[PDB]
Design an enzyme around this catalytic site. Structure first.
Site, PDB file in Angstrom:
ATOM      1  N   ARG A 174      12.599 115.309 -17.585  1.00 38.41           N
ATOM      2  CA  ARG A 174      13.144 115.006 -18.918  1.00 38.41           C
ATOM      3  C   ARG A 174      12.189 115.232 -20.089  1.00 38.41           C
ATOM      4  O   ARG A 174      12.577 115.049 -21.248  1.00 38.41           O
ATOM      5  CB  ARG A 174      13.687 113.569 -18.972  1.00 38.41           C
ATOM      6  CG  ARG A 174      15.004 113.339 -18.238  1.00 38.41           C
ATOM      7  CD  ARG A 174      15.422 111.876 -18.344  1.00 38.41           C
ATOM      8  NE  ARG A 174      14.833 111.031 -17.308  1.00 38.41           N
ATOM      9  CZ  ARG A 174      14.820 109.697 -17.348  1.00 38.41           C
ATOM     10  NH1 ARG A 174      15.365 109.057 -18.382  1.00 38.41           N
ATOM     11  NH2 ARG A 174      14.269 109.002 -16.349  1.00 38.41           N
ATOM     12  N   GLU A 196      11.869 119.733  -3.742  1.00 34.42           N
ATOM     13  CA  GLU A 196      13.313 119.754  -3.502  1.00 34.42           C
ATOM     14  C   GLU A 196      13.664 120.748  -2.420  1.00 34.42           C
ATOM     15  O   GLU A 196      14.432 120.440  -1.496  1.00 34.42           O
ATOM     16  CB  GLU A 196      14.069 120.137  -4.770  1.00 34.42           C
ATOM     17  CG  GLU A 196      13.936 119.150  -5.904  1.00 34.42           C
ATOM     18  CD  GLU A 196      14.695 119.620  -7.141  1.00 34.42           C
ATOM     19  OE1 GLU A 196      15.943 119.561  -7.107  1.00 34.42           O
ATOM     20  OE2 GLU A 196      14.051 120.069  -8.123  1.00 34.42           O
TER      21      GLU A 196
END
Ligand code: HEM
Ligand code: HEM
Ligand SMILES: CNCc1cc(OCc2ccc3ccc(N)nc3c2)ccc1Cl
Ligand SMILES: CNCc1cc(OCc2ccc3ccc(N)nc3c2)ccc1Cl
Ligand SMILES: C[C@H](O)[C@H](O)[C@H]1CNc2nc(N)[nH]c(=O)c2N1
Ligand SMILES: C[C@H](O)[C@H](O)[C@H]1CNc2nc(N)[nH]c(=O)c2N1
Ligand SMILES: [Zn+2]
Lengths: 403, 404
Positions: free
Chosen positions: A110, A284
């Site tokens: 973010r 990931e």
């Protein structure tokens, strides 16, 4: 009332006051914390959520109370009063999408929230049109490896009319082919979606990395099948910097993580099809996608190639193999010049984000269990940082699978 | 369906429901508006209800719930509070209580072992010298020359109008932390304050990275007294690596016995301010937290340089590589020295088995995910993929403010 938030590596203390702006209930009560659960178990409603959002929007551009503000509030009120609903101006939509990312407690990326390309696809009337927008999204976002964050927003939900939906969980996904000998070829997370594609007439392949077609659905219509042009979908063959045998595994992953099953909520309006993409954090792919037992599950194979002791947990063969796999992903993406961030750089950037947000809003909603990476947790600064979790609107939400 | 939290395992696809959480009387830090789960530290009428509750728990455990002896014990506890303002536990009650406190501990990954806990009753102890003797016996028993045994020693309870028995140290074994004049810390920085307290109380300090701290022990209404542990009672394991021969030359070591001593054991509203307990280590505790935390021994960079890694960039994963080898060195050396240890894989697997036991035995198990998941290789272990419900059951171990 206001939570004392401590960093245990540095001794720093903050106080979250942003949480007071939370209007939606999470799953915890004073009797039990349910923080580790993945998913959740009238017209003045909408109007109050709308007013709150418009108020946010005009505060963002520093024009609160002004006549353009006060007029925009009445437009919103007049439309709801007559139609039970209303519509966003594009600029407002751009703002709302950025805030939803900014408010996403589970996103470690973010620091980037203000830089987000927003495509307005609210003038979509068919699956075919949805396909064009998606193809363009992918081209823009991929940018030949210099990835750029983007979101495309399809028409909002309307009372007594089916939703616009992308059936796939991500824009790019590898097929999962269930062999009748118990096993699965490809990505086991994608078995069900692969089967939906086949039933809707897709001719299936038989590789471990067959890129799936998109099933796109316009309101109250059967979903339609679209094959993505193979040149639109950038992929990275994985190789290791020192282990020359690694490339011989034929492992590869796609460049673009583009999530397409989430619902975007802005000012009480809901957008059921609003795919968004950023870039990958290496773990990931390297840890979750390739090493998870219920995924490609390659831990043992790599460990054997490395000639480790598989017979016992105490040789840490799993930990060793996992590190090499993650290293292969970083090296390879850097080699192929595709944007990627390692979990140390990411977490370090997230701490800076926390500090910016603390000054900006008095807090930052964050979900520790998702922000802390899946390997080497305490070796990152986020591990040692206490975090407050709550729901701010605008927000991304989960929604049921349309089938 | 069920009006209880639904709990999912994402690896296996299996669902359970937690009904045990209904038994919780004490509130945690979370609310519908915000989750504070990642936060580390968040009258005779009140006593009697807790006392009645625990007596009911105890009689349930021995299958005599509703019986004559159950009801007489209830009346007996009530009358005792009625004349003294407190009451006393019987031996078997204390044993059940201590075990249930460990069983109830949300942050402990070692709870598979909870029924095998040796409970030393030390409620007769009346001096700091005698506290020392009891502590020494605990260490001897629990260390058992490397074949470690879980144990707890329970000193007298909080009494109205009388000072607490307190062990000042956070563990029975801890390394000194010597603050340097050049700003840095020699030894374990975690222990700077207790080291300075020991010195202020007359200890002559060393200057090593691994000097074993003396114990500061406090009997009621008396200043704490200082006790040096006889070195042979304190088993240490020199660290070496199975394949990297230079690792031995780093001179790193750790102690065998993890013995937490600053926690408060609460049972039926009775509060035991001194009740040190000990099990054995999980390898990541030493290898990852104590040795690699930036605010602890912080040896990550040292080891990575010896491994000749590129420490100028994050994407070389040098931290991850060194961390793994450090952890491996912990495991290898403890095994070589024949000192009980468990790696994070074996531990987490055993915790899944525990969750299954407790699902059947009690309808659930209070668990703090952020603490159960190990500090390296998180998703490589099965607990990462296990949803957990966190809540406070009593009897419990609780944090308490430091005596000074
Ligand atoms: C630009 C680089 C970005 C990085 C490095 C990043 C990183 C991550 C990671 C590692 C996760 C955990 C995901 C998982 O394990 O499934 C996550 C979650 C999430 N991200 Fe990001 N992200 C980025 C961009 C974005 C953008 C552009 C959006 C939307 C505008 C976004 C929205 C979200 C949301 C809503 C979640 C939570 C998903 C959930 O609740 O299941 N991210 N992010
Ligand atoms: C037998 C082997 C045992 C193992 C492997 C084990 C493992 C662990 C680990 C790894 C932690 C995490 C602590 C941290 O990172 O600071 C922990 C916490 C804890 N353990 Fe166990 N444990 C064992 C035995 C015991 C025993 C005998 C007791 C008490 C009777 C106990 C009570 C606790 C409590 C209360 C905590 C939480 C401490 C806190 O909340 O700060 N454990 N355990
Ligand atoms: C929660 N179950 C998995 C799940 C993850 C989802 O998001 C994963 C996600 C979301 C946004 C991301 C942004 C960037 C990135 N590199 N990965 C990202 C990964 C969305 C829906 C579901 Cl069902
Ligand atoms: C809160 N973190 C510091 C802290 C840890 C504490 O306990 C850690 C702890 C407790 C019990 C353990 C039992 C066995 C073991 N291997 N490690 C164990 C580690 C107690 C008090 C404090 Cl203040
Ligand atoms: C049960 C547990 O909460 C679940 O497996 C979570 C844990 N943390 C995670 N963190 C991230 N980033 N992504 C995930 O999918 C998960 N899964
Ligand atoms: C802020 C965060 O809660 C803190 O660093 C926690 C995380 N999980 C932990 N888990 C264990 N086992 N031990 C710890 O000390 C911590 N610390
Ligand atoms: Zn919570």
């Amino acid at each position: 009332k206001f939570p004392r938030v401590k960093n245990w590596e540095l001794g720093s203390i903050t106080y979250d006051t942003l949480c007071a702006q939370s209007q939606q209930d999470g799953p915890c009560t004073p009797r039990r914390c349910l923080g580790s659960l993945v998913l959740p178990r009238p017209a003045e409603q909408l109007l109050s959520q709308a007013r709150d959002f418009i108020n946010q929007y005009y505060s963002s551009i520093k024009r609160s109370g002004s006549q353009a503000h006060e007029e925009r509030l009445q437009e919103v009120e007049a439309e709801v009063a007559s139609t039970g609903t209303y519509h966003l101006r594009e600029s407002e939509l751009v703002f709302g999408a950025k805030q939803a990312w900014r408010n996403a407690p589970r996103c470690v990326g973010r620091i980037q929230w203000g830089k987000l390309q927003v495509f307005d696809a609210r003038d979509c009337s068919s699956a075919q049109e949805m396909f064009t927008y998606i193809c363009n999204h992918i081209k823009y976002a991929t940018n030949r490896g210099n990835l750029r964050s983007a979101i495309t927003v399809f028409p909002q939900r309307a009372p007594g009319r089916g939703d616009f939906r992308i059936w796939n969980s991500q824009l790019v996904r590898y097929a999962g082919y269930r062999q009748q000998d118990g096993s699965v070829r490809g990505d086991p997370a994608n078995v069900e979606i692969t089967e939906l594609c086949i039933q809707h007439g897709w001719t299936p392949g038989n590789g471990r990395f067959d890129v799936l077609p998109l099933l796109l659905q316009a309101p109250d219509e059967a979903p339609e099948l679209f094959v993505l042009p193979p040149e639109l979908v950038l992929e990275v063959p994985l190789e290791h910097p020192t282990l020359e045998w690694f490339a011989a595994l034929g492992l590869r992953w796609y460049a673009l993580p583009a999530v397409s099953n989430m619902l975007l909520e802005i000012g009480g309006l809901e957008f059921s099809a609003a795919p968004f993409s950023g870039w990958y954090m290496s773990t990931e792919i390297g840890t979750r996608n390739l090493c998870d037992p219920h995924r490609y599950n390659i831990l043992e194979d790599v460990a054997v190639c490395m000639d480790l002791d598989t017979r016992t947990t105490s040789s840490l063969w799993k930990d060793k193999a996992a590190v090499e796999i993650n290293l292969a992903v970083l090296h390879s993406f850097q080699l192929a010049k595709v944007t990627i961030v390692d979990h140390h750089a990411a977490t370090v950037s997230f701490m800076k984000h926390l500090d910016n947000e603390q000054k900006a809003r008095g807090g930052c909603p964050a979900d520790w269990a998702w922000i802390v990476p899946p390997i080497s947790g305490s070796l990152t600064p986020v591990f040692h940082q206490e975090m407050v979790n709550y729901i701010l609107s605008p927000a991304f939400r989960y929604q049921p699978d349309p089938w």
